[PDB]
Structure formats: C-alpha cells, structure tokens
Design a protein around this nucleic acid. Structure first.
Length: 89
DNA sequence: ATTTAAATAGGGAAGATAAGCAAAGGGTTGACGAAAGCCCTTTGTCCCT
C-alpha cells in the first residue's frame, strides 16, 4: 500500500481525528490527537477534491485503512519503520 | 305552624353451529459546489527631468 501512501502524500494529504468541516464546509481546520488513538479508533482524511486511487478492487486508501484495524497496525510499528514513518509524517 | 317510628327484596339451569371478506391502474419535476488555475484591472511605491 506504499504505492497509494506516496500518492496520497504527493497530494495535499492530511489525516485527522478532529476537524471542523463537519460543521461548516469553508473551515479547513484539522486536528490529530495523540492520546485518543486505540485498538478501534477510526480516523478521517482530507485531500483537495477528494482525489484518490484504486487498488484493483474498488477501494481507496480510506477503505483500506479502516478495515481490520490496519491503522493501528501501521501506527504501533509492527509492519516496520518503512511505512510507520510515512504514516507519522 | 305541623306530616312517626321500627322489621326485610329468594334460591337454580342454560346463553347454537356452517359457509364465505373481489379484481384491475398510477404514486412529478425544477433550483440549493469549494479548491485551483487563468488573465485583467486598479492602485501602493519608487522613479526622473
């Protein structure tokens, strides 16, 4: 999923768990919390115009990153530092 | 204006079953998009001659 991670970081590409776009659309205020991520915490992601890339199944990065608790699995660092550094950046 | 007070209201048995509750048709349309790129303009800012 590195070929989709670098594509999302080549775009605007922000990841948050607290935003203000759910109240007013013209906000663009994004907050990521460090003390709230757990074993089932789901996060959201923003890029301009919601541009994405499939994975030869019909899934973007958001559909991959929330299924089977993958975000904690890259976040805790059990998949190596090759993708954990890209996730932390 | 006056006009009475006491005693008591029954026990029993039943309250029917059979049949069926239609069929087609339809259920509106129009407004309520941010981020980025591109040219054009109108006015701060320094200039000379």
């Amino acid at each position: 999923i590195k070929e989709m991670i670098e594509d999302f970081i080549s775009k605007g590409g922000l990841i948050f768990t607290h935003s203000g776009r759910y109240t007013n659309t013209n906000n663009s205020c994004f907050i990521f919390n460090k003390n709230d991520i757990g074993v089932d915490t789901k996060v959201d992601m923003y890029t301009p115009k919601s541009a994405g890339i499939k994975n030869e199944e019909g899934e973007n990065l958001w559909q991959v990153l929330n299924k089977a608790n993958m975000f904690y699995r890259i976040y805790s660092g059990e998949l190596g530092e090759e993708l954990q550094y890209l996730l932390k950046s």
